[PDB]
Design a protein around this ligand. Structure first.
Ligand code: CDL
Ligand code: PC1
Ligand code: PC1
Ligand code: 3PE
Ligand code: 3PE
Lengths: 71, 175, 69, 347, 86, 115, 318, 114, 80, 95
């Protein structure tokens, strides 16, 4: 249960990143649509930098540095 | 809500050595190190290095620096213990490493690096852990693997230590 | 003979205050019940899950079986 | 000292170097260096005079910090695409710091500053064990990591070793120092060829070990720290001296003697590749070392002109001082040039 | 290579230049060496624990143990040098 | 961060209490300063010092025995694995090795403390 | 809310130090067959405030320090360590729950000696130097042994948590599974503090505490502070490690009470041991540790590495 | 170089299981008992093909199973389960050696009825 | 032997007893009957999710439904 | 002269801690594991002379896992447009 829930959450989050990126980066110097950067296209875990970003910066504190120094 | 604290601790850590390495006497040497090392606990811990950080907080801080300051205190006796000299190039390298360190934290836009050493890359964001593993340190279990898998490795270490004993006393002239 | 035992009593109040302090402050500030212990990443993950599903941002209110209804 | 403990130390030095050769992991090799230092500090200092203490220190600083720099390079390898193995380094920089590090481990041009000093400080046997045995580990590492070596560095360090280190020793009347600078020159060669055909590097390594072996062993036969001591032994007994001189010419690479063989093969596999100018630039300096050593060969003659040869020093009793394997290595470093089709046995 | 790596390297080289360019006090030399050694401990730790490569976590420990039994050797040679003169 | 606040406080109260302890005595009602203090001649307490190898050696053995101790420290994690044979073998081996160092140094002239 | 927790932790250990000094003077008094202080306040409860504000107010008194740095460093360090040592100690609840824990206390306890190196260093008196070096020597030598003991008695917990210790204690006090190692660790706790027998002294002796206890006035009320507070600690950490009570949740103050009682009684036993026995001469002390304690600790240790695998109970790391 | 494709937002947004870790722990023990026809299968799915976003459909399946599980415990045994997870939620690592009476009590309502 | 041990146990009981705890601590883990239990326990605690495999076209054992007994059974720990 | 005894006597010594893909204490995947698997799958039987040449693509893939130079630079490229569009409002979707 926790696994399915988690992975749905992260996929949702990454797609939201994709649409925001799509809105902001419309302009001439096109990198085109959101792409992997690897030469081989297959699933690779998110960086946790990719997921949490542009996020208001409050929950990157507790998510990235949160676990260390406990609650 | 700064959360650059890994980088602040990195910077103060550098500062310890920068302003540290000069001046003639070790008596402040101990201070400079122990400061920088405790900050090292800062770094390692802030990556979640908890045990390892505590080991540089036990062996190196306590064992090393205590034994150093013990010998220094025993070997040299300081009547004056003044402000001495030689710190000029240390502060001037705190300025050259202040606009050089501020050059690597300035040019950090996109990727920053140097033309002397290997490449670097830079920018303001930081990569870390996810993918929780239930009831694992990811570290201390590693050292449990030291005792399980580290057969040859603990052999060479321990042997090199016992040789440590016979060498040290042998040089202090038991005869 | 009894001279020392009042002093010992005062030492007893004096070392006994922080225990009741921290315990009651868990049982108050942290909700009705104890603070969670996050030592292992799994338990933290469950915490922040409770956090997200609380709607209060707090792991104090645990929701409950009927929250699905 | 105890006659056991020396066995329980030398055993650990042999062990350490064996680990540097055997292990496929970096951290191990780093440990092997650490053990060769830790256990090689007691061998030097065997007699308690202060010379061995200050000299053993100058060995300890530069040797240990060399080890640390090695660890730094290993770690930079970990940074760049990385795993712990023994194989081509994936960083050009890590390879740079590692060539410098292994350039301190064994004497090389910018880093050779300690070798003459420490070699004169410590006694004879420590002199043997310093200039031969500990010289096996770093080459055994370079043979491994050569694919990522930046050519320009090791070629440089080699030449500057030959020029500087070889050119040195001129005013030196001491022996241990001479053996040091010659060590740095043979270094310049062994490392010169290292990138082209390492077989020759191991060759000049082995021949070199035999050379310094008979040399120091003879210095144990006739206990001599100076050339004056050599002449005075010439009027005590001749044979040991002419062994010392002939082995010194073999240390100069004079054509009939066996020391000419590594130079000669190095010139083949050096010049079948493109550059012919650099080998000659080495052979010049090689002549320099030569006629220095042949100054040390006009140290002697018969119907001598006055050397002030003194007296008391005829003796009725032969010496029992035990020379371990002198003869086999004497003939083996004089007579070997009529061999070497045997070269390839080495690799 | 992030930033922290850059900075720790600069600490490393501060210690190293401090090693080579000051011969005055010997304890200071030996020290600077040891501080550099600490910096290596920090590097290997941060890296290994960054990549979650667990079986290799010894490199801080076993790298740190020779920070000592070698260093202790260092100080013993320091004492035996000092009692030559002073 | 929480324990870091505890360190910020606990460092304050140290600093504050120290400061109070310096102010009040030289904030006192009357402070008077006369007497000479002779650093002066070597035999006041002790004289000179010929620092002796014993104590230093105690620092040393404190190092080597530390190293072996911390090398032993992770064991409570390692006492449970799927290889028990090797575990017992090299834990008993390791601290046995510590005791070998001690036994050696206890056999030679080291320690013995009356010299 | 959190700083409330900090204050409630650290203020009562200071008050605990003052009234501790009171109980010390009294217990030694009657142990010596004579009443302790009655004439400061009723029954002696105003005695600490006397000692406190007076001993603060006596003027700084000597000498040129030669280091302004260390002189005002060492006291701050000694306190700060003595105050932060109390953090992990379990209580019903730790106030910082650390996974490692007990080896963190071990570690800071290892740092505590810089106050002795520096304190005794800045005297400018070449005798107080030597004294300090020696006190560092004995403190350090008993930092060797103690560590191994924790590294043994813990091995029945299965983890360092310092919380799970209270879980192991539920059925049987840890004093029973190993009494002897607990005995050696009690005497070890006497070591660092240098309570009698292990204390150095006045009259004719090394007089480390001669200038150490003399010098720095108010800051001597500090070294005073960290020493006694550190004592109360090691008593508490004994009470937690080698014994303990049952924790009934919903009513933690029960366990807090029982914990408190046993700890206080233990400290009482410190102060009356100090009354009881003479002092060891120095070498007989140091190589009394090297002679006998450390070997038997090695034996008991390896016997606790091999034991749990024998009986097939090896502890459950969570 | 290659451009990733991620499923439409509406490919997500399936269902909800909202409960605390505490209730989810013991209730988890029981459904892990009776459920796991779908979700083990799911685990050879995302384990065998591993590409989360490939198998998420079967994530919908497992979420379905757990959902209807909690539904049955809603309409079937309500109160005893409530007191049970509320006594297990006094937490301190939520120990199952703590509140036993309502473990046997809960399995007593369950077994006695369902 | 007997006199030697009586004398070393007369002089230095701490050291004799230390060697006793040592040696007995060495040998006893080999003999004692309970040894294997600890190993089988330690192996019986999963830290890592058991991951299923394709069933069809296999030799039947360790069956699907967790109640179906064919797999390993730690029941010996259930009552011990 | 690097010698191989440990393949001769048939004993593992350092082969366990050698690379990230080895069996872990309780198997936990390394961050970049799979790309180790493909880099060693590509470069296994070959001689590191032409492994340089032909395994380059997949190797660079592995590097881009480990160091994360390029992707980090990409996120940077996102904030660099975000910055100058704080002036010209793109507002925000998030809460
Ligand atoms: C139940 C309890 C079981 C138990 O205790 O098991 C044993 C236990 C471990 O076994 P285990 O836990 O059951 O199983 C572990 C597994 O096997 C997993 O562990 P493993 O597979 O890693 O096994 C490691 C094991 C096995 O290790 C290996 O197999 C590694 C082999 C590496 C290659 C070595 C080649 C040596 C060739 C030398 C030839 C000459 C060299 C010089 C030539 C040029 C000369 C000019 O390591 C050792 O035994 C230690 C290394 C021994 C090396 C001995 C040779 C050293 C060089 C000597 C050179 C000669 C010098 C003479 C003096 C000269 C003076 C002038 O401990 C040991 O095996 C020994 C530990 C203590 C070693 C002390 C060494 C010093 C002794 C005093 C001197
Ligand atoms: C490759 C092998 C390299 C060998 C280097 C030297 C090893 C011996 C070290 C001796 C240490 C010592 O103190 O000796 C002093 C003693 C004499 O000094 P001493 O007698 O004053 O002190 C010795 C003290 N005890 C006895 C307690 C140890 O022995 C010698 O000096 C003899 C040295 C003989 C060197 C022989 C070299 C042979 C080289 C063969 C190469 C073959 C390659 C083949 C490849 C295929
Ligand atoms: C003393 C505290 C004991 C606590 C409990 C532990 C019990 C076992 C303690 C060790 C036995 C002590 C016996 C007394 C004599 C010790 C002499 C000694 O060790 O000398 C160093 C000995 C020297 O042996 P030697 O052959 O030179 O002869 C003794 C010479 N003296 C005493 C002058 C040094 O070195 C070695 O044993 C070589 C290295 C051994 C490496 C470790 C092997 C462990 C076992 C593997 C199986
Ligand atoms: C090119 C190849 C050239 C030949 C290389 C082979 C060398 C073989 C060893 C020659 C040994 C000669 C010898 O034994 O001389 C005798 C002498 C002592 O006399 P002995 O009969 O032993 O009785 C003692 C009474 N005084 O001996 C002594 O005093 C010293 C004894 C030396 C003992 C060590 C012998 C080692 C033999 C194996 C060497 C293998 C080398 C192979 C690789 C060579 C590479 C160049
Ligand atoms: C001139 C001198 C100037 C300086 C003077 C200083 C005076 C005081 C010196 C003594 C005090 C040293 C204090 C060291 C604190 C170490 C804390 C630590 O290691 O905590 C361990 C803990 C492990 O957490 P864990 O339980 O694993 O996990 C929680 C749930 N996951 O870890 C955590 O929970 C994470 C905590 C991380 C917080 C950052 C730590 C920064 C430390 C900076 C130290 C600076 C001082 C250095 C020492 C100087 C000594 C002279």
């Amino acid at each position: 249960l926790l696994q399915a829930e988690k992975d749905r959450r992260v996929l949702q989050m990454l797609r939201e990143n994709l649409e925001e990126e799509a809105t902001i980066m419309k302009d001439v110097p096109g990198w085109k649509v959101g792409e992997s950067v690897f030469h081989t296209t297959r699933w690779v875990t998110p960086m946790m930098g990719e997921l949490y970003g542009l996020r208001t910066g409050e929950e990157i504190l507790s998510s990235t540095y949160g676990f260390i120094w406990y609650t | 809500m700064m959360t650059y604290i890994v980088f602040i601790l990195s910077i103060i850590f550098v500062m310890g050595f920068v302003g540290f390495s000069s001046k003639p006497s070790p008596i402040y040497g101990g201070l400079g190190l122990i400061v920088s090392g405790g900050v090292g606990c800062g770094i390692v811990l802030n990556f979640g290095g908890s045990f390892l950080g505590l080991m540089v907080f036990l062996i190196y801080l306590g064992g090393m620096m205590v034994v150093f300051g013990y010998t220094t205190a025993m070997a040299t006796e300081q009547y004056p213990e003044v402000w001495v000299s030689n710190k000029v190039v240390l502060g001037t390298f705190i300025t050259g490493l202040l606009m050089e360190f501020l050059m690597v934290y300035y040019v950090l836009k996109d990727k920053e690096v140097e033309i002397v050493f290997k490449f670097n890359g830079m920018g303001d964001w930081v990569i870390y852990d996810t993918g929780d593993s239930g009831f694992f340190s990811e570290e201390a279990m590693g050292i449990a693997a030291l005792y399980s898998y580290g057969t040859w490795l603990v052999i060479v270490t321990g042997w090199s230590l016992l040789i440590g004993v016979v060498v040290i006393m042998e040089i202090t002239r038991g005869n | 003979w009894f001279e020392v035992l009042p002093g010992i009593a005062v030492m007893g109040v004096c070392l006994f205050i922080p225990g009741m302090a921290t315990a009651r402050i868990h049982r108050f500030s942290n909700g009705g019940r104890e603070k969670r212990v996050a030592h292992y990443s799994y338990q933290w993950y469950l915490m922040e899950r409770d956090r997200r599903v609380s709607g209060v941002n707090r792991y104090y209110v645990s929701k409950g079986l009927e929250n699905i209804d | 000292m105890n006659p056991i403990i020396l066995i329980i130390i030398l055993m650990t030095v042999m062990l350490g170097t064996i680990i540097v050769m055997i292990s496929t992991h970096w951290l191990l090799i780093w440990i092997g260096f650490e053990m060769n230092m830790l256990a090689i500090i007691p061998i030097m200092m065997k007699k308690h005079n202060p010379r061995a203490t200050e000299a053993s220190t100058k060995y300890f600083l530069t040797q240990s910090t060399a080890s640390m720099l090695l660890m730094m390079a290993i770690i930079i390898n970990l940074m760049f695409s990385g795993q712990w193995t023994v194989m081509k380094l994936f960083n050009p920089m890590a390879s740079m710091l590692m060539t410098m590090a292994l350039a301190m481990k064994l004497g090389m041009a910018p880093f050779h500053f300690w070798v003459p000093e420490v070699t004169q400080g410590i006694p004879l046997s420590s002199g043997l064990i310093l200039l031969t045995w500990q010289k096996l580990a770093p080459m055994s590492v370079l043979y491994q990591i050569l694919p990522s070596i930046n050519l320009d560095l090791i070629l440089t360090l080699s030449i500057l070793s030959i020029t500087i280190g070889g050119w040195g020793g001129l005013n030196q009347t001491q022996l241990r120092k001479i053996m040091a600078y010659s060590s740095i020159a043979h270094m310049g060669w062994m490392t010169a060829v290292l990138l082209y055909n390492p077989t020759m590097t191991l060759l000049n390594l082995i021949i070199y070990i035999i050379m310094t072996s008979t040399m120091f062993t003879l210095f144990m036969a006739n206990s001599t720290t100076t050339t004056l001591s050599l002449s005075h032994t010439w009027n005590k007994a001749p044979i040991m001296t002419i062994l010392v001189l002939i082995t010194l010419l073999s240390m100069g690479g004079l054509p009939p003697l066996s020391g000419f063989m590594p130079k000669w093969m190095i010139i083949q596999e050096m010049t079948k590749n493109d550059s012919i100018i650099l080998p000659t630039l080495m052979a010049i300096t090689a002549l320099l070392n030569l006629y220095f050593y042949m100054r040390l060969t006009y140290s002697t003659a018969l119907t001598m002109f006055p050397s002030t040869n003194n007296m008391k020093m005829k003796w009725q009793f032969p010496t029992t001082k035990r020379m371990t394997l002198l003869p086999t290595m004497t003939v083996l470093s004089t007579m070997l040039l009529p061999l070497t089709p045997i070269l390839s046995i080495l690799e | 290579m992030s930033l922290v790596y850059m900075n720790i390297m600069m600490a490393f080289t501060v210690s190293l230049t401090g090693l080579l360019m000051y011969r005055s006090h010997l304890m200071s030399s030996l020290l600077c060496l040891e501080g550099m050694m600490l910096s290596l401990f920090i590097l290997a730790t941060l890296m290994i624990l960054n990549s979650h490569f667990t079986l290799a976590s010894m490199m801080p420990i076993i790298l740190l143990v020779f920070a000592a039994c070698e260093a202790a050797l260092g100080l013993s040679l320091l004492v035996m040098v000092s009692n030559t003169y002073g | 961060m929480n324990l870091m606040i505890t360190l910020l406080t606990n460092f304050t109260l140290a600093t504050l209490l120290v400061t109070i302890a310096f102010w009040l005595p030289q904030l006192n009602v009357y402070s008077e300063k006369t007497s000479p203090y002779e650093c002066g001649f070597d035999p006041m307490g002790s004289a000179r010092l010929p620092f002796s190898m014993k104590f230093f050696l105690v620092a040393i053995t404190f190092l080597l025995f530390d190293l072996e101790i911390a090398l032993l420290l992770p064991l409570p994690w390692a006492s449970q694995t799927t290889n028990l044979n090797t575990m017992l073998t090299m834990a008993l081996l390791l601290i046995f090795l510590l005791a070998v160092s001690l036994a050696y140094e206890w056999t030679q002239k080291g320690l013995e403390w009356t010299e | 809310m959190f700083m409330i927790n900090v204050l409630t932790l650290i203020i009562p250990i200071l008050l605990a130090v003052a009234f501790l000094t009171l109980v010390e003077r009294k217990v030694l008094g009657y142990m010596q067959f004579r009443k302790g202080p009655n004439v400061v306040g009723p029954y002696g409860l105003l005695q600490p405030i006397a000692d406190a504000i007076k001993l603060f107010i006596k003027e700084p008194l000597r000498p040129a320090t030669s280091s302004i740095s260390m002189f005002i460093l060492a006291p701050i360090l000694a306190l700060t360590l003595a105050l932060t040592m109390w953090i992990p100690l379990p209580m019903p609840y730790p106030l910082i729950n650390m996974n490692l824990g007990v080896l963190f206390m071990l570690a800071m306890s290892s740092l505590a000696v810089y106050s002795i190196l520096w304190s005794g260093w800045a005297s400018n008196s070449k005798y107080a130097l030597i004294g300090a070096l020696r006190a560092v020597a004995q403190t350090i030598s008993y930092e060797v042994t103690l560590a191994i003991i924790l590294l043994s008695v813990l091995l029945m917990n299965g983890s360092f948590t310092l919380s799970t210790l209270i879980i192991t204690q539920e059925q049987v006090w840890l004093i029973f599974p190993a009494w002897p190692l607990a005995m050696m660790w009690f005497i070890s706790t006497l070591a660092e503090t240098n309570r009698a027998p292990f204390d150095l002294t006045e009259g004719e002796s090394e007089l480390v505490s001669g200038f150490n206890v003399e010098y720095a006035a108010g800051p001597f009320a500090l070294f005073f502070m960290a020493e006694y507070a550190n004592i109360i600690m090691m008593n508490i950490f004994t009470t937690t490690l080698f014994l303990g009570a049952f924790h009934n949740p919903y009513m933690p103050e029960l366990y807090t009470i029982n914990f408190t009682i046993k700890s206080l009684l233990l400290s009482i036993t410190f102060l009356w041991i100090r009354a009881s026995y003479p002092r060891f001469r120095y070498d007989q002390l140091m190589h009394l540790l090297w002679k006998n304690f450390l070997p038997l600790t090695l034996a008991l240790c390896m016997w606790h590495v091999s034991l749990p695998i024998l009986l097939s109970s090896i502890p459950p790391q969570t | 170089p290659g451009i990733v494709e991620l499923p439409s937002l509406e490919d997500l947004k399936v269902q909800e299981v909202k409960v605390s870790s505490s209730v989810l722990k013991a209730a988890a023990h029981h459904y892990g008992a009776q459920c796991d026809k779908p979700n083990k299968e799911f685990m050879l799915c995302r384990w065998e093909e591993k590409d989360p976003r490939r198998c998420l459909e079967e994530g919908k399946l497992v979420n379905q199973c757990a959902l209807e599980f909690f539904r049955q415990i809603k309409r079937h045994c309500a109160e005893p389960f409530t007191e049970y997870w509320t006594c297990i939620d006094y937490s301190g690592l939520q120990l199952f050696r703590r509140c036993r009476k309502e473990q046997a009590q809960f399995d007593k309502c369950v077994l006695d009825k369902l | 032997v007997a006199a030697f041990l009586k004398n070393v146990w007369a002089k230095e009981p701490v050291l004799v007893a230390s060697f006793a705890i040592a040696g007995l601590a060495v040998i006893l883990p080999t003999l004692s009957p309970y040894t294997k239990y600890s190993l089988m326990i330690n192996r019986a605690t999963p830290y890592n999710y058991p991951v299923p495999l394709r069933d069809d076209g296999n030799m039947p054992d360790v069956p699907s439904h967790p109640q179906d007994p064919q797999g390993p059974s730690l029941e010996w720990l259930k009552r011990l | 002269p690097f010698f191989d005894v440990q393949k001769k006597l048939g004993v593992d010594l350092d082969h366990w801690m050698t690379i990230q893909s080895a069996e872990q204490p309780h198997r936990i995947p390394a961050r970049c594991h799979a790309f180790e698997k493909e880099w060693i799958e590509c470069a296994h039987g070959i001689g590191s002379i032409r492994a340089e040449k032909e395994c380059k693509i997949e190797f660079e893939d592995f590097r881009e896992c480990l160091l994360r130079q390029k992707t980090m630079k990409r996120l940077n490229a996102i904030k660099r447009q975000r910055d100058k569009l704080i002036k010209e409002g793109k507002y925000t979707p998030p809460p």
